[PDB]
DNA sequence: AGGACAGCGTGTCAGCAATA
RNA sequence: UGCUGA
């Protein structure tokens, strides 16, 4: 029921416990990044009746 | 972050990039950090009977 | 009673119930009684009503050959919607769920069975299938009827809808309530006008507006002339028509002169002015050639035999009759009654003439009734019936007039060949709103009628079967006294809802406790109780003079003459009847007693009205205490304390329910209206109508064309007590932010507001709107082959991953302009056509319904595509505060710039304090304090008018419960500067309050033209916003250009960005039309003259080119000298 | 229609208060107490929670 | 395999060119296209 | 020549749906 | 024609 724009704001306002200081900032237009600026994580969940 | 009802689903990756509260809020990392002045109060005569 | 568990202060605890989302066992109840007039009343209008209105219905003879055959229609059914045919599977019900996915009319089918014969010895009943009818949502003859909420949300539905309205072509039209004059009630005017109808005729008369059984109603005016005569203009299908009364009261009564000059001269027997009158009446024009009933009904029959159209085989007797059923006093059904009733009309012509009583105003809600769904729809469908009639039997005299005796074999065949009618007509009265009629119905508007009912808030689509539009017409009149809020709409009309433009003072809405009548009585047994009482009948021995005794009137029917000392005694006791629910007296009638005395007050006597169409009000009986309910007129002449303290012991006759029972629903939602100024708090009612909200439950379903979303509303933390008892948390409006008034940024002036940035950031009144566009592909085609499919032929570049082979965007997908929307498919041919998105703005699809052709054999033709458009605030968006103060966002201000406060917190609203001072909406300055009270101490205030006095103030109150916090009383904190760091010298004033975000965004208002569609008739800008669209300059801005002498911008603009076009003319003979080009060197020459070096160009305009083609057009020419 | 995960004045969480902040309203509690055994100081933070209406409940009861 | 469900029924109907749009188990008449994985990207601002 | 009268008139400012 | 904005 929630949109994905709406899901995407509020996966922004979650906080990350990654200490900011052992990365760096993405290049303008480092749309891929690496290992020394992004951090990846996934949901994936379904709901079934038990 | 939502509820589902079943038959829903949800499916994606998050990429987290650094940033300075300055550009989002999002990237802020304190609830607040105000300060105030000390107050001072000074009792002019002996208040005292109620 | 039905007031009663209505919440004493507002609650919290209901959100946060471990019960919140169970839908409850039956519907809420009170939201229910607001749509309950347009429900109630189709209810009867459909089955009770409609029997009626064809027991009318004169049997239609008419002449084939040379016979003479008889059509009536014994009965007239209407159906709940279902599957056309049966060609259709699974489920005959048809639920309003669909025909708004599939975009169609939720219509029943109405069928009646004639009964055709000849002479009278040969007869049969066929039955025929008449048309199709629209259906209201929950009126008996819906699907939707005795359901509970838990079912009702398997269909989909609101689990809390209340329908009273209709679904035209998936749009809910909201017929509303109109006003018209009164029902079988004689108003005495003076209207100026009056005396062009005729050359002796003054400005004096009674109007009657009569309706039987609410299928029938007509307008009947009593003239005054110099002379001391009576003229009765009675219409008939739009052509006004006069007799001079004598004719009437002879044909209508087989009596005497005296008799009847005896009843036109009953109150004053003294006057000799008027008994010299009335004799004038029955000898000047009727001992002119007939005196007796009969013959005056020949005469009468003769002169209006042509402009009746009556049956020509009909005796000129039998046609006057045709007459006075049709056109006078159509309430009551004997002749002897319509002469008492067309009597005190006169009676009454009399006294205002000389000045022994006083003009009604037509304006007051005294002289007012509504005019409701039922009555519209029944006084339509009982027309178009007669109609049907006549065109059958038009078709029947006109196709053979052939030996109907083996005739009887396609007399089916025939009544069907006219049958083909009754559906079209229906739909445009509701689908345009207009009205097409060869009688207005007896109405005088015929435009404005149903109008669209929009869900853009629950506080708007609420107020649309609230409302009372006193006349479409009056929007267009020099003097405004229509628009004066009289003193006689308290309790029925709200004050302050009314539309602050144009609409002013014309479309109101009703109070909250107000309400239409709707339900029918028996009321025979009233005419022998009132006789009990003490009333006289109108035959005789009334025991006094005739002039110190009152007319009783019961429903347009005279009982007559109550005494002068036992009216009073008689009106108590009939008022205690109705309260007591004793005898049969309606609980709504309205006993009125007009008392007299010798100055020129309104006409005296008893009245009694308990028709189907006023309004009415509860209102506490003292010295019963039993709820009783009192109408427009029935309120003049009693008093009514609104707090008790101000009740008396011989004054104060009745008492108020509540003492906010004066405002309307909606002005019962603006927290404190009490200490705002009043043109704020009309506004209030006014722009909680454009308020993005939370419309609805129901997406996926609606396929609307707009829908604005807000995303996380809250409730307000300060709310009137009434707000709860409509639950309207089912639906919330804004969100509460932490306001202060502190002068600080310098872009917060002159009614601009700031909004922190991190606020907005953190998801601070996010919304969307929801555009569903029906793609119906029966268009780029006519009945040809199929060129509609949706579908992608294999591979085609330009749909290569837009599209998901069946020429629909994917569901999830975002579009840009320029991007693939929709890949039709001409089967024969074989060929596609990508048809692109055109909006110069992103959004994403969200669902996509395919719909079927009602029979479920549609081809792929009929699609609706939701698109979802995220409408954040931006700049220049519009938010508003519950008490009138609107503005613009003016600025993002960032959040460590914000002045925070010693508590570390720093507001999310910034509103300069200089609105305050000449806008006095001292409510803002409450509701602040009262939401931080709130917010501070987990409670709910309520905001409910009336209820703080001068001696229990608000700001005390809440001042305590601050400073019970360890804030300040006066409700002042104060804070740093963010950009200095420094405590400001003054405190600052700060506080929680409800905002609401309108619907005007910049995003909707803001357009460039540089180039584009040039008009082709004048070469100019085309305008709208959809294409390029330009500015039209105007007369009035031109004249400001050149006061600066500023001649080369005015011609710079003008030529050179408008129509600058470079023409030829003959310049001997100075002709534009003159100049010709060979065909393909290309040398103009003139054609009237044979020179072809004269022609040379001239700067000039295209319309002026444009004129001196029009002039041709007329044989004027334009001889223009070149230079 | 679901709970903001952050207040919008300050910024501080409130995400994951509110089966807690339904659980004590269960228990006996009044809204002061409860928003108080939160840790919701200051009251724009306790209007995020108190003046919540939680329509993505009635949302989630119309067909799949 | 374009997959729409019904508007009650909520049964997978494929539908193509040349047939008609009714709803099988039942006979409705509306029917809403159904959300394949395809991947999308949205910012969180 | 005292009238009677029939006869023209205008009416701030831009948008949207929708439909003739 | 019903709406809406200054
Ligand atoms: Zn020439
Ligand atoms: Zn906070
Ligand atoms: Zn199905």
């Known amino acids: 029921i929630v949109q994905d724009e709406i899901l995407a704001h509020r996966l922004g306002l979650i906080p990350i416990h990654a200490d900011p200081r052992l990365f760096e900032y993405r290049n303008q237009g480092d749309e891929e990044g690496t290992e020394i600026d992004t951090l990846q994580f996934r949901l994936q969940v379904r709901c079934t009746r038990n | 972050i939502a509820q589902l009802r079943p038959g829903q689903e949800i499916d994606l990756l998050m990429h987290c990039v650094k940033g300075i509260g300055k550009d989002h809020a999002k990237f802020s990392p304190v609830a607040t950090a105000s300060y105030r002045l000390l107050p001072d109060i000074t009792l002019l005569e002996p208040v005292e009977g109620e | ?1123 | 229609m679901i709970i903001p995960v952050r207040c919008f004045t300050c910024g501080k969480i409130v995400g994951n208060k509110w089966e807690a902040y339904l659980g004590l309203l269960q228990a006996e509690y009044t809204e002061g107490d409860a928003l108080d055994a939160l840790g919701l100081k200051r009251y724009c933070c306790r209007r995020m929670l108190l003046a919540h209406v939680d329509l993505i409940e009635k949302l989630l009861n119309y067909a799949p | 395999p374009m997959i729409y469900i019904c508007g009650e029924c909520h049964t997978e109907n494929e539908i193509k060119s040349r047939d008609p749009i009714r709803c099988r188990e039942c006979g409705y008449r509306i029917m809403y296209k159904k959300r394949t994985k395809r991947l999308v990207v949205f910012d969180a601002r």
């Not at chain 3, 009273?164 to 009164?182: D, H, Q, T």
């Not at chain 3, 025939?414 to 689908?431: H, N, S, V």
Request: charged share 20%; aromatic share 10%.
């Open chain 3, 1 to 1123: 009673s039905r007031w009663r568990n209505l919440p004493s202060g507002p609650s919290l605890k209901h959100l946060t119930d471990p019960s919140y989302g169970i839908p409850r066992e039956q519907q809420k109840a009170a939201l229910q009684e607001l749509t309950r007039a347009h429900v109630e009343s189709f209810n009867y209008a459909v089955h009770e009503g409609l029997g009626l209105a064809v027991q009318a219905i004169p049997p239609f003879e008419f002449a084939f050959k040379d016979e003479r055959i008889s059509f009536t229609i014994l009965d007239a059914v209407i159906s709940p919607p279902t599957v056309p045919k049966g060609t259709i599977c699974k489920e005959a019900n048809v639920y309003p769920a669909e025909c708004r996915g599939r975009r169609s009319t939720y219509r029943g089918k109405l069928t009646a069975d004639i009964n055709w014969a000849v002479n009278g010895i040969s007869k049969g009943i066929i039955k025929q299938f008449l048309g199709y009818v629209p259906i209201m949502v929950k009126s008996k003859l819906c699907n939707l009827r005795n359901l509970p909420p838990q079912a009702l949300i398997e269909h989909h539905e609101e689990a809390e809808e209340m329908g009273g309205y209709f679904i035209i072509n998936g749009i809910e039209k909201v017929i509303r309530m109109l006003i018209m004059p009164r029902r079988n009630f004689p108003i005495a005017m003076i209207r100026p006008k009056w005396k062009t109808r005729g050359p002796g005729y003054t400005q004096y008369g009674v109007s009657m507006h009569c309706v039987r059984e609410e299928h029938s109603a007509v307008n009947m005016n009593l003239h005054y002339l110099e002379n001391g005569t009576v003229m009765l203009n009675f219409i008939y299908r739009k052509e006004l028509f006069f007799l001079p009364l004598g004719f009437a009261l002879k044909a209508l009564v087989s009596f005497s002169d005296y008799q009847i000059f005896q009843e036109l001269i009953k109150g004053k027997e003294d006057d000799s002015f008027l008994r010299n009158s009335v004799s004038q009446m029955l000898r000047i024009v009727m001992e002119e050639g007939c005196s007796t009933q009969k013959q005056v009904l020949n005469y009468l029959g003769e002169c209006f035999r042509v402009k009746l159209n009556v049956p020509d085989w009909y005796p000129n007797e039998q046609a006057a009759e045709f007459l006075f059923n049709q056109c006078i006093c159509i309430h009551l059904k004997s002749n002897t009654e319509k002469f008492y009733m067309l009597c005190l009309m006169t009676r009454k012509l009399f006294a205002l003439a000389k000045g022994e009583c006083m003009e009604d105003n037509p304006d007051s809600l005294v002289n007012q009734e509504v005019l409701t769904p039922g009555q519209l729809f029944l006084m339509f469908l009982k027309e178009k019936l007669e109609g049907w009639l006549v065109s059958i039997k038009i078709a029947f005299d006109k196709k053979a007039q052939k030996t109907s005796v083996s005739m009887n074999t396609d007399n089916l065949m025939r009544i069907f060949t006219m049958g083909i009618d009754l559906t079209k007509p229906f739909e445009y009265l509701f689908a345009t709103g207009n009205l097409r009629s060869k009688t207005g119905l007896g109405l005088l508007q015929d435009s404005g009628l149903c109008v669209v009912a929009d869900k853009l808030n629950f506080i708007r689509y609420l107020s649309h079967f609230r409302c009372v539009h006193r006349g479409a017409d009056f929007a267009k009149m020099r003097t405004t006294t229509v628009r004066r809020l009289l003193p006689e709409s308290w309790g029925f009309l709200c004050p302050v809802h009314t539309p602050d433009g144009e609409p002013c003072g014309l479309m109101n809405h009703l109070t909250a406790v107000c309400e239409v009548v709707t339900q029918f009585v028996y009321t025979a047994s009233i005419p022998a109780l009132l006789c009990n009482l003490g009333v006289t009948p109108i035959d005789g021995a009334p025991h006094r003079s005739y002039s110190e005794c009152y007319p009783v009137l019961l429903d347009g029917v005279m009982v007559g003459w109550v005494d002068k000392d036992l009216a009073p005694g008689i009106a108590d006791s009939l008022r205690h009847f109705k309260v007591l629910r004793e005898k049969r007296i309606p609980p709504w009638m309205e006993v009125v007693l007009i008392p007299m005395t010798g100055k020129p007050s309104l006409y005296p006597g008893l009245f009694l009205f308990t028709t189907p169409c006023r309004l009415v009000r509860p209102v506490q009986n003292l010295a019963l205490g039993k709820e009783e309910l009192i109408g427009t007129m029935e309120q003049i002449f009693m008093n009514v304390a609104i707090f008790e303290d101000e009740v008396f012991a011989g004054v104060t006759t009745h008492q108020e329910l509540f003492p906010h029972s004066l405002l309307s629903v909606i002005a019962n939602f603006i927290p404190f209206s009490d200490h705002n100024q009043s043109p704020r708090n009309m506004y209030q009612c006014q722009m909680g109508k454009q308020t993005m909200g939370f419309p609805l439950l129901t997406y996926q379903d609606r396929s609307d064309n707009k829908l604005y979303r807000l995303q996380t509303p809250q409730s307000p933390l300060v709310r009137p007590s009434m707000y709860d008892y409509y639950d309207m948390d089912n639906y919330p409006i804004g969100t509460n932010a932490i306001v202060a008034v502190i002068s600080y940024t310098g872009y917060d002036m002159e009614d601009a507001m700031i909004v922190n940035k991190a606020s907005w950031e953190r998801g601070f009144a996010h919304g969307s709107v929801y555009k569903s566009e029906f793609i119906d592909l029966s268009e780029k085609i006519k009945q040809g082959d199929s060129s509609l499919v949706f579908g992608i032929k294999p591979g085609d570049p330009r749909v290569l991953q837009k599209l998901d082979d069946d020429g629909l965007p994917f569901i999830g997908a975002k579009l840009q302009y320029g991007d693939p929307y929709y890949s039709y498919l001409n089967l024969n041919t074989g060929e596609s056509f990508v048809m692109y998105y055109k909006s110069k703005e992103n959004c994403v699809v969200d669902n996509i319904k395919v719909c079927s052709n009602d029979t479920g054999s549609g081809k792929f033709k009929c699609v609706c595509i939701t698109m979802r458009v995220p409408r954040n605030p931006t700049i220049g968006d519009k938010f508003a505060s519950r008490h009138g103060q609107k503005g613009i966002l003016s600025r993002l201000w960032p959040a460590e710039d914000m002045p925070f406060t010693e508590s570390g917190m720093v507001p999310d609203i910034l509103f300069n304090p200089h609105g305050f001072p000449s806008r006095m909406t001292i409510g803002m300055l409450i509701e602040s304090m009262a939401g931080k009270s709130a917010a501070l101490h987990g409670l709910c205030h309520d905001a409910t008018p009336f209820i703080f006095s001068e001696e229990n103030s608000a700001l005390e109150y809440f001042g305590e419960m601050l400073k019970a916090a360890g804030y300040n009383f006066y409700g002042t904190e104060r804070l740093y500067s963010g950009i200095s760091g420094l405590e400001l010298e003054a405190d600052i004033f700060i506080g929680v309050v409800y905002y609401q975000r309108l619907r005007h965004m910049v995003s909707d208002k803001f357009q460039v033209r540089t180039t584009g569609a040039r008009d082709r008739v004048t070469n100019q800008p085309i305008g709208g916003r959809n294409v390029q669209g330009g500015i039209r300059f105007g007369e009035m801005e031109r004249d400001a250009l050149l006061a600066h002498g500023t001649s080369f911008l005015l011609h710079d603009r003008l030529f050179n960005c408008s129509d600058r076009s470079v023409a030829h003319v003959c310049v001997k003979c100075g002709s534009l039309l003159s100049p010709l080009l060979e065909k393909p060197n290309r040398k103009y020459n003139c054609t009237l003259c044979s020179r072809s070096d004269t022609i040379d160009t001239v700067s000039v305009p295209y319309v002026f080119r444009y004129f001196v083609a029009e002039l041709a057009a007329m044989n004027i020419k334009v001889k223009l000298d070149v230079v």
